[PDB]
Write a protein that binds this ligand. Structure first.
Ligand SMILES: O=C(O)CNC(=O)C(=O)O
Ligand SMILES: [Mn+2]
Lengths: 220, 18
């Protein structure tokens, strides 16, 4: 994985941004399979596992900054990308940032000028999950949720852990958390979703992109 | 209710400018 321009790649990236714009505006979510390729994705996974084994993950928290394991059962680490052993995570974030930048001005009326650090997450089996929720119900600035999944050879019948999305349609969209899949969806009340109980270690990275005007309301 | 179930977001001093 060259973490640092081919013509075919540059043209593909334009095509991907056009798909993302259309799919988010039309359906409220977009799936991109094989986003980084297996070599780069393996490096991301290896760095996430090394971080987890190093004992730096805390409990996932709710908007009141408290944890209730029966509501949200993941362990998380906030990663900016420049920490030791995180170059592949930084590479992922740069690829997502480039994708979002190519969509700027075409995603609703949002103006995206910032995002969270990477939220690296593990649901450590044991039937842990995240009950149905909305990422941004109260105008906290988050406009697009991006998930990157890291689970090789995952079988949801055995291991659960699907993301179930309920696009604001009368139907559930059941999404497997498969290795090297990117998922984007509007963060607000249009997209309730839940992480179904996981029966194996389930890894993912989240980036939340902010709408500048709404995000200002959170300044302190 | 959904208000209490949202995932925590670090406050703006931790935001990454694009
Ligand atoms: O990990 C997933 O598939 C979904 N995660 C969340 O919805 C979250 O942390 O808000
Ligand atoms: Mn969520």
């Amino acid at each position: 994985c060259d973490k640092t321009e081919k013509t075919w790649q540059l043209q593909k990236n334009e095509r991907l941004s056009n798909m993302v714009v259309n799919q988010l505006n039309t359906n409220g979510f977009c799936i991109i399979n094989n986003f980084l390729g297996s070599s780069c994705s393996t490096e991301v996974l290896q760095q996430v596992l090394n971080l987890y084994q190093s004992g730096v993950f805390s409990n996932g928290q709710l908007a009141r900054n408290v944890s209730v394991n029966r509501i949200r059962g993941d362990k998380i680490a906030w990663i900016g990308g420049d920490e030791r052993g995180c170059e592949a995570i930084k590479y992922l974030s740069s690829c997502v940032d480039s994708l979002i930048s190519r969509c700027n001005g075409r995603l609703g009326n949002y103006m995206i000028t910032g995002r969270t650090k990477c939220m690296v997450a593990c649901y450590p089996g044991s039937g842990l999950g995240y009950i149905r929720h909305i990422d941004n119900p109260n105008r906290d600035g988050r406009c697009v949720t991006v998930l990157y999944y890291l689970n090789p050879n995952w079988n949801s019948q055995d291991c659960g852990g699907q993301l179930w999305l309920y696009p604001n349609e009368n139907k559930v969209v059941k999404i497997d958390p498969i290795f090297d899949r990117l998922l984007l969806f509007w963060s607000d009340r249009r997209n309730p979703h839940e992480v179904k109980p996981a029966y194996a270690m389930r890894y993912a990275i989240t980036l939340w992109y902010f709408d500048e005007k709404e995000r200002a309301l959170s300044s302190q | 209710d959904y208000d209490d179930l949202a995932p925590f977001v670090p406050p703006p001093s931790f935001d990454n400018r694009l």
